[PDB]
């Protein structure tokens, strides 16, 4: 086509979606990880995770307001990944990298799994 | 912070949100423009437009599944802008620039209004 493109549009959209999350506006699901609860937008979860994409395209699970993750999933690893989904920023540290990689493999977030494998290989 | 960043994350998120729109997955509103109907995600509309942000943060309008725009709004101008919201790409042409600018002013999409003003000033 003969379209023009606004370079910062996608980043600005994601910034506003994170502002809506922080104010709990139009969140439509709660992700339960052990004792911890995380509110989010199903569309953003699907856009970032192969696991959530599969869950919310299912004709029965698409209507659930609560999703319980596998009890092996660490709440901190999930929190770091949820923050990454809404910001593009990953808080990867020596003390959390194993929990982050395991959570990213479960959530099917290929690019996060790739950077965790590379950072572990370096050490 | 000490975060790392994935450059393509925001663009990849927006690409997936457009894939969901194209398949009519988790769309939660229909925007009526004269005789024409457009399905979309309220969160994406809010993230891109000052008008939709105001509408869906309203305690009564947040629950509406149908929004009717002002009858002066041109369906083609709206379609071009909805496509821009989900792609960052604007199909700006000599034959549609006046309708696109008027629709962007109504929708409160400041960056689109700015490029339309500049393209009109050049001609």
């Amino acid at each position: 086509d003969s379209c023009i493109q606004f370079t910062r549009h996608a980043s600005d959209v994601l910034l506003n979606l994170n502002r809506l999350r922080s104010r709990d506006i139009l969140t439509d699901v709660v992700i339960v990880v052990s004792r911890e609860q995380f509110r989010a937008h199903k569309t953003v979860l699907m856009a970032c995770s192969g696991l959530f994409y599969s869950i919310f395209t299912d004709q029965l699970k698409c209507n659930l307001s609560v999703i319980n993750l596998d009890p092996e999933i660490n709440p901190e690893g999930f929190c770091i990944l949820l923050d990454f989904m809404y910001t593009s920023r990953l808080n990867l540290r020596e003390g959390n990298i194993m929990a982050v990689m395991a959570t990213a493999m479960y959530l099917q977030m290929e690019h996060v799994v790739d950077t965790c494998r590379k950072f572990i290989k370096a050490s | 912070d000490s975060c790392i960043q994935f450059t393509r994350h925001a663009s990849d998120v927006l690409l997936n949100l457009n894939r969901l729109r194209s398949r009519d997955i988790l769309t939660d509103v229909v925007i009526v423009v004269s005789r024409e109907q457009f399905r979309a995600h309220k969160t994406v509309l809010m993230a891109c437009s000052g008008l939709f942000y105001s509408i869906f943060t309203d305690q009564l309008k947040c629950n509406l599944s149908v929004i009717n725009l002002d009858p002066e709004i041109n369906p083609e101008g709206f379609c071009i802008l909805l496509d821009f919201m989900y792609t960052s790409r604007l199909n700006l042409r000599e034959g549609n620039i006046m309708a696109v600018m008027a629709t962007a002013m109504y929708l409160q999409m400041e960056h689109v209004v700015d490029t339309c003003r500049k393209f009109i000033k050049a001609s």
């Binding site: 379209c3 023009i4 493109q5 606004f6 370079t7 | 790409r89 604007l90 960056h111 490029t115």
Partner: peptide, 4 residues
């Protein structure tokens, strides 16, 4: 704005 750019030419993509």
């Amino acid at each position: 704005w750019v030419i993509p």
